[PDB]
Amino acid sequence: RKAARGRECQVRIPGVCNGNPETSVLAHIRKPPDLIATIACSACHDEIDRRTHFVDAGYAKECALEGMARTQVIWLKEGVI
Amino acid sequence: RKAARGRECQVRIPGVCNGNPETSVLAHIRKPPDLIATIACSACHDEIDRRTHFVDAGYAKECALEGMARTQVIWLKEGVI
Ligand SMILES: [Ca+2]
Ligand SMILES: [Ca+2]
Ligand SMILES: [Zn+2]
Numbered sequence: 373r374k375a376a377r378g379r380e381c382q383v384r385i386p387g388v389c390n391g392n393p394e395t396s397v398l399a400h401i402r403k404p405p406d407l408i409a410t411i412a413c414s415a416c417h418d419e420i421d422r423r424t425h426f427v428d429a430g431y432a433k434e435c436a437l438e439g440m441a442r443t444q445v446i447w448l449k450e451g452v453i
Numbered sequence: 454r455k456a457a458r459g460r461e462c463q464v465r466i467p468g469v470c471n472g473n474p475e476t477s478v479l480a481h482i483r484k485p486p487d488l489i490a491t492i493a494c495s496a497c498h499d500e501i502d503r504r505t506h507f508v509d510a511g512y513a514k515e516c517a518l519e520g521m522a523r524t525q526v527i528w529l530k531e532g533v534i
């Protein structure tokens with residue numbers, strides 16, 4: 373599942389997102405399981421982890437978890453899970 | 454997984470939650486898959502689905518998805534998934 377590298381960001385915080393799938397990683401939602409994670413570009417990853425705080429933490433969290441649900445939905449369709 | 458019946462609500466919107474696990478069901482997050490769902494008491498279920506709108510929709514969504522992550526984490530621990 374850590375092979376979400378090079379996929380589209382599912383977090384997509386406006387402004388913060390870089391939209392560049394080359395930067396995408398499996399970003400764990402806060403040894404946590406890879407299921408409980410979202411594909412996130414480098415920028416969104418730093419924001420959802422609160423290494424940056426460009427946006428409100430509730431909104432970041434909302435986007436992170438929305439991203440997690442989209443990611444799991446991708447895994448479902450693709451046969452990954 | 455629809456055997457989340459009688460478990461504790463993982464959504465727990467303050468005020469809205471009834472806290473009564475007898476009312477709990479597997480509430481799908483919006484034929485969607487049961488993975489993309491949370492254990493929710495009857496009250497939280499109606500709120501996250503927007504049948505009631507006691508709280509802000511962004512906050513409800515946040516709680517719903519947080520509930521989904523907690524539920525999946527329960528499924529992981531319990532061997533359900
Ligand atoms: Ca940007
Ligand atoms: Ca109550
Ligand atoms: Zn992004």
Ligand SMILES: [Zn+2]
Pocket residue numbers: 462463464465466469470471472493494495496497498
């Ligand atoms: Zn509840």
